[PDB]
Structure formats: C-alpha cells, structure tokens
Amino acid sequence: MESTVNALTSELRDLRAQREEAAAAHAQEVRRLQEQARDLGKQRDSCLREAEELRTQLRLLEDARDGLRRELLEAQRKLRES
Amino acid sequence: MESTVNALTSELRDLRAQREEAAAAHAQEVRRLQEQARDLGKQRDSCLREAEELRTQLRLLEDARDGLRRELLEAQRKLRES
C-alpha cells in the first residue's frame, strides 16, 4: 500500500505548498491596495486644503472685480453728465 | 493500513474544499480593496478638477480686475480734463 499512501501524501503536500504561496501573493496584493488607498486619500485631503485656499482667494477677487465694475460705471455716468 | 489511507483521503477532501473557499475569499477581499481605491481616486480627481476650475477663474478675474482698475483711473482722468 506504500505507493497509494505516497501518492495521497504527495497530493496533500502539493496543496499545502500551493496554499502557502497563494497566501504570500495575496498578502502582497492586499498591502499594495491598502497603501494605494492611504495615498489616494492623502492626495485627496491635500487637494481639498489647496481648493479651500483658492476658494478664499476667488471670493475676495470676485468682490474686488465687482466693485471696480460698479465704480467704472459710476465714473462713466459722471462723464456723461459733465 | 486502511486507517492511514482513509485519513489522508479525508484530509485531502478538506484541503481541496479550503482551497476553493480561500480562492473566493481572496478574490472578494481584493475586489473590496480595489473598489476602495477607485472610490478614493474619484474623490481625488474631483478635487483636482475643482482646483483647475478655480485656477482658471482666478486668472480670468485677475485680468478683468486689472483692466477695470485701469479704465476707472482713465475715466477719472477724462473727468478732470472735461
């Protein structure tokens, strides 16, 4: 019965080696995807900070532009009435 | 012995079942992590788009502000010469 026992043990050890190597490859892929997520989240939060500062500057610039538009129209009124 | 052959046959059925279950579990976990990376990447991209749009508006409105200020000064000058 030695050959049958050897054949079954061979199959069991094949499966154990396959399992160990599949686990190693899976751990590598999981770590890669986890770090990808952490880094995309950091890029996102950083851009969010930049966009907040740009929005602040745009609010102030929009207000300044609007006031100069207003004042030009008033100056042109005075030119007409003159 | 029949006890050793049947023990190995039983262990083999269990290990093959575990291999199939693990392959599906690994695929599910990777799929979940890949979706997380896609979610975070879309969040990052949307912020990048907003930042680009803000930078565009800032350039357009600085041009407009500066021109209006020049034309306000010139309209005031014309009124003094009127």
From Swiss-Prot, chains A, B:
Subcellular location(s) of the protein: Cytoplasm, Cytoskeleton, Microtubule organizing center, Centrosome, Centriole; Cytoplasm, Cytoskeleton, Cilium basal body; Cytoplasm, Cytoskeleton, Microtubule organizing center, Centrosome
Post-translational modification: Phosphorylated by NEK2 which may regulate its association with centrosomes.
Function statement: Major structural component of the ciliary rootlet, a cytoskeletal-like structure in ciliated cells which originates from the basal body at the proximal end of a cilium and extends proximally toward the cell nucleus. Furthermore, is required for the correct positioning of the cilium basal body relative to the cell nucleus, to allow for ciliogenesis. Contributes to centrosome cohesion before mitosis.
Homology family: Belongs to the rootletin family.
Subunit organization: Homomer. Interacts with KLC3, NEK2 and the N-terminus of CEP250. Interacts with CEP44. Interacts with CCDC102B (via N-terminus).
Name of the protein this chain belongs to: Rootletin
